[PDB]
Amino acid sequence: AQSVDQLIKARGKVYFGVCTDQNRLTTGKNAAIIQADFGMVWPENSMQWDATEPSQGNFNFAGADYLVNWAQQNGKLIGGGMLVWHSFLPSWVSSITDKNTLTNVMKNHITTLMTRYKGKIRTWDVVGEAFNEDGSLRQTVFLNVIGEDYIPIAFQTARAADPNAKLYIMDYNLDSASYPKTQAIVNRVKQWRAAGVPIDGIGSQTHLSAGQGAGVLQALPLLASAGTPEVSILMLDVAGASPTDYVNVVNACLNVQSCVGITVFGVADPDSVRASTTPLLFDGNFNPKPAYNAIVQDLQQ
């Protein structure tokens, strides 16, 4: 019955958030649960590249406008993204082979989305999933055509477009301190910031198997050692939804001063991409699960 967003605010954090979109807000009990329990919303799909720029320079904002308007009406913070990602890319982007062309396409995509919502978006995920598992840079069209400068260019462009937004890089499999990807993103973000690249946060896209929450207690402090002003947990889900794993992720954020909050990947189990693992905090009747109650109790104490 208690609101995890209200309780995490009382502990000095900024939000407990959730991913959603128009399709969810008009079905189930998603809107009522988000109103009650979550302080920030993120677009599942409506701000990805294939949704917003399906043909070059032919932008479609309908889904994204719906979410932003709903969030403002209901007093919720808004996160946006992903601005630069190799998934959900339209084919017209991935066929460009010219550096100047792709650089201008990328800057225009970033600037157009960020200007439309200027001042209304707390956090933008600027670049996502830029690292391979061995810590090398993922060979996406942006890396292949622009070079490693594409990441500085993307963040510099985003800062100019809306200097009020917090700018994040995001990746998954950052859940263990000794994993090569964890080491690499920390080292590269340190170097980028030392050269003045405006990276405000690292977002950890946390998709856990049973028992992996304990590792986050060590991994998240390591991510925070890169020196960004903020870190966060994003797109969180946990196979089996054990209270032990969920409470460990919450405690990791409570233990890390720069952790501003946690976002879960959805509201109810049946709408998960891995629904067979019942990995979310509400069940198929929209009742809170034991893991939700455990987080409430941990935050109350």
Ligand X SMILES: O=[N+]([O-])c1ccc2nn[nH]c2c1
* Helical ranges in 130-212 per DSSP H: 141-146, 150-161, 180-194
The residue from 234, 250, 267, 281 that contacts ligand X (CB under 6 A) is: 234
**49 touches ligand X (CB under 6 A):** no
Binding segment toward ligand X, per CB under 6 A, in 41-49, 96-104, 192-200, 270-278: 41-49
The residue from 265, 280, 288, 299 that contacts ligand X (CB under 6 A) is: 265
Residues 180 to 209: which contact ligand X by CB under 6 A?
none
Longest dimension (CA), the chain: 56
- From residue 62 to residue 81, the character string flagging contacts with ligand X as x (rule: CB under 6 A) and all else as - is -------------------x
**82 touches ligand X (CB under 6 A):** yes
Report DSSP letters for 115-150, one per residue.
Answer: HHTTTT-SEEEEEES-B-TTSSBP--HHHHHH-TTH
Q: Give, in order, the Cα–Cα distances in Å from 183 to each of 52, 172, 188, 236.
A: 33, 13, 9, 21
Cα Rg, the chain, nearest whole Å: 18
The separation between CA 109 and the C-alpha centre of its own chain, rounded to angstroms, equals: 18
Q: Do residues 150 and 85 touch, judged by C-beta distance below 8 A?
A: no
Is cis: bond before 114, omega within 30 of 0?
no
Residue bearing tokens 């942006």: 142
Closer residue to ligand X (CB): 42 or 179: 42
Closer residue to ligand X (CB): 42 or 150: 42
Q: CA 217, CA 295: separation in Å to the nearest integer?
A: 15
Closer residue to ligand X (CB): 44 or 171: 44
- From residue 125 to residue 154, the character string flagging contacts with ligand X as x (rule: CB under 6 A) and all else as - is x-----------------------------
CB of 34 to ligand X, least distance (A): 13
**96 touches ligand X (CB under 6 A):** no
The residue from 224, 235, 250, 294 that contacts ligand X (CB under 6 A) is: 235
Q: Do residues 220 and 252 touch, judged by C-beta distance below 8 A?
A: yes
Closer residue to ligand X (CB): 99 or 272: 272
Q: Site for ligand X (CB under 6 A): how many residues?
A: 11
The residue from 42, 49, 117, 155 that contacts ligand X (CB under 6 A) is: 42
**19 touches ligand X (CB under 6 A):** yes
At 142, phi and psi to the nearest 5? Answer: -65, -45
- What residues line the site for ligand X (CB under 6 A)? 19, 42-44, 81-82, 125, 234-235, 263, 265
